[PDB]
Amino acid sequence: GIDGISSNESNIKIGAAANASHPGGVAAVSVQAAGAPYNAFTGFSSLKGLAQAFAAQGTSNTNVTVGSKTFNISHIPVSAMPPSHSALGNFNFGQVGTQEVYFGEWWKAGDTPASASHTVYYAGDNTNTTVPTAGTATYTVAGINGSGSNLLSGTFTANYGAGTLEGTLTGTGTAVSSLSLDGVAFNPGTAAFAGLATANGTAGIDNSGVVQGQFFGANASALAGIAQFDNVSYNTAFGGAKN
Ligand code: HEM
């Protein structure tokens, strides 16, 4: 019952957890850039535990408040993992509150988020998702773009009757300074949305963005998605909690 995707399946796939060395959780990520056994699907809640426990070795786990909503942010650098884990690279990912909804990024060991290996993804449990067919709701949304310390933040507006998702994420500490949805749409009553996006930031305006994501949870209590660009520095993952 896990849905989600990544911007580069050569590097990252999303699925259900199956990692015997780090068991636990359901929504999961696989580093396809790695060979077995290190391409196992590992639950995000398991990775969150590891990020909590290995803080003295360089991981971090932090609750970040945006408005009245909390996003739990995990940073896992390759330097904090055992030497055998070299191929696993670097992660930043967030959880939407206590919901089983995760969004994040990855890049190869020795790279930066500006490198070609920069990959963004999202994952969530769809078991009890329902999408309203009418009315409007807003979401407090956090975005990850090349940092586990500095987030993007904004408000998305879902018009469930029109099937539109609108809004902008902004922040001061990332390559992206602003990320606006453009024509992001969904069939009313269904969870999956897609559209375009524009970004501003350290490389200037970039109109090449494409967006995909979905609503999660009873009454669409959450959303998550990715925006990817010709400029991979601008690739962003996001997660939102319904206000
Ligand atoms: C990202 C996905 C991960 C995968 C696929 C993975 C995979 C594995 C595998 C296959 C083993 C057993 C073989 C070995 O020792 O290398 C293992 C052990 C271990 N892993 Fe991971 N791991 C992941 C994340 C992490 C993280 C984030 C940490 C800590 C920051 C970590 C710390 C450890 C530790 C402490 C052991 C026990 C062996 C030792 O003490 O060196 N792992 N992992």
Q: Estimate the helix proportion, in percent.
A: under 10%
Give the total of domains: 2
Global outline: globular
Number of strands: 17
Beta-strand content bin: over 45%
* Each distinct ligand: protoporphyrin IX containing FE
**What's the total helix number?**
1
Strand order in the sheet with the most strands:
10-11-12-13-14-15-16-17
Rg, nearest Å: 17 Å
Main beta sheet: strand number and arrangement?
8 strands, antiparallel, barrel
N→C terminal distance? 25 Å
Structural class: mainly beta
Secondary-structure element order, N to C: EEEEHEEEEEEEEEEEEE
Walk me through what this model shows.
It is a single chain. The protein is mainly beta and 243 residues long. It folds into two domains: 1-128, no CATH class; 129-243, no CATH class. 4% of the residues lie in helices and 50% in strands. The protein has one helix and 17 strands. The protein has an eight-stranded antiparallel β-barrel. It has a six-stranded antiparallel sheet with strand order 1-9-8-7-6-5, with helices on one face. A three-stranded antiparallel sheet has the order 2-3-4. The two termini are 25 Å apart. The chain binds protoporphyrin IX containing FE. Protoporphyrin IX containing FE binds next to helix 1.
